[PDB]
């Protein structure tokens, strides 16, 4: 699968649920899994969002440092879903704060991080097909 396509479709879905149209089985599974993740932990995402202090100056370092912490002890499919949801939070905050250009940057950062830092783990653990298999019963 193309990680760029997965990121772009995921970001567009998350923004469209907020009423913002951003120009840009795996997709459906990730969408449902991220929605389920979000609804379980709204209190934590709200605190995360309030502390984000998103500006074009801080956005990249904020993303990089959070993702580094997220994978400090390794990777699992839950961490992958959280990676997408955290990127989604930054995208939603971007448009809410009239910094919509940052969405393109976040999509780039997510795509390149997947391809550089997560591709080996994903393939080693059966590819995106394994994620679809794992979460299928929850759909």
């Amino acid at each position: 699968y193309d990680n760029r396509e997965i990121v772009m479709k995921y970001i567009h879905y998350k923004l469209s649920q907020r009423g913002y149209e951003w120009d840009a089985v795996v997709h459906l599974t990730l969408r449902q899994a991220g929605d389920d993740f979000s609804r379980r932990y709204r209190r934590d995402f709200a605190e995360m969002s309030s502390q984000l202090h998103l500006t074009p100056f801080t956005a990249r370092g904020r993303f990089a440092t959070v993702v580094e912490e997220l994978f400090r002890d390794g990777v699992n499919w839950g961490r992958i879903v959280a990676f997408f949801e955290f990127g989604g939070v930054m995208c939603v905050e971007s448009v809410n704060r009239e910094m919509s250009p940052l969405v393109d940057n976040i999509a780039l950062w997510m795509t390149e991080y997947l391809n550089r830092h997560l591709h080996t783990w994903i393939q080693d653990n059966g590819g995106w097909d394994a994620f679809v298999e794992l979460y299928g019963p929850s759909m």
Partner: peptide, 21 residues
């Protein structure tokens, strides 16, 4: 340190989530 806190909670939530599959 903001990112350490965020990342720590995302890991906790991630691990709870995946362990419930």
């Amino acid at each position: 340190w903001l990112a350490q806190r965020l990342g720590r909670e995302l890991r906790r939530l991630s691990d709870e989530f995946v362990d419930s599959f």
